[PDB]
């Protein structure tokens, strides 16, 4: 049952090395893992909403409280960007 929801991603700037929220809203897709093996609510994102001059694409997101660390706030001035980082390079940032 790949359900669908509405959230946002997080673009990064190499000139300042920062992770701000993307102006595009797009949407996510709740998924019960590829075959309900890890019970991981795979969240598939995709440009299916109203963008703002920034063309994006589908981004497979994962949710594991026992593997990827949950980062709702990165100290300093920050609204609410839920970012999950594992250890190698599977670290994505999201904002609602």
Swiss-Prot record:
GO terms for molecular function: ubiquitin binding. Its main location: cytoplasm. One of its GO terms (cellular component) is nucleus. One of its GO terms (biological process) is ubiquitin-dependent protein catabolic process. The keyword Cytoplasm applies. Keywords: Acetylation, Cytoplasm, Nucleus, Phosphoprotein, Proteasome. Signal peptide: none annotated. It is found in: Cytoplasm; Nucleus. Residues 1-96 form the Pru domain. Present with 12200 molecules/cell in log phase SD medium. Belongs to the RPN13 family. Component of the 19S cap proteasome complex which acts as a regulatory subunit of the 26S proteasome, involved in the ATP-dependent degradation of ubiquitinated proteins. Component of the 19S cap proteasome complex composed of at least RPN1, RPN2, RPN3, RPN4, RPN5, RPN6, RPN7, RPN8, RPN9, RPN10, RPN11, RPN12, RPN13, RPT1, RPT2, RPT3, RPT4, RPT5, and RPT6. The 19S subcomplex associates with the 20S proteasome subcomplex to form the functional 26S proteasome. This is 26S proteasome regulatory subunit RPN13. The gene is RPN13. The chain holds residues 6 to 101 of 156 of the full protein.
């Amino acid at each position: 049952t790949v359900i669908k929801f509405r959230a946002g991603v997080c673009e990064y700037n190499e000139d300042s090395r920062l992770c701000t929220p993307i102006p595009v809203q797009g949407e996510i897709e709740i998924k019960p893992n590829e075959e309900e093996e890890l019970g991981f609510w795979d969240f598939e994102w995709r440009p299916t909403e109203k963008p703002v001059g920034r063309e994006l694409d589908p981004i497979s997101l994962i949710l594991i409280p026992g593997e990827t660390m949950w980062v709702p706030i990165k100290s300093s001035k920050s609204g609410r960007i839920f970012a999950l980082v594992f250890s190698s390079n599977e670290r994505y940032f999201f904002w609602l």
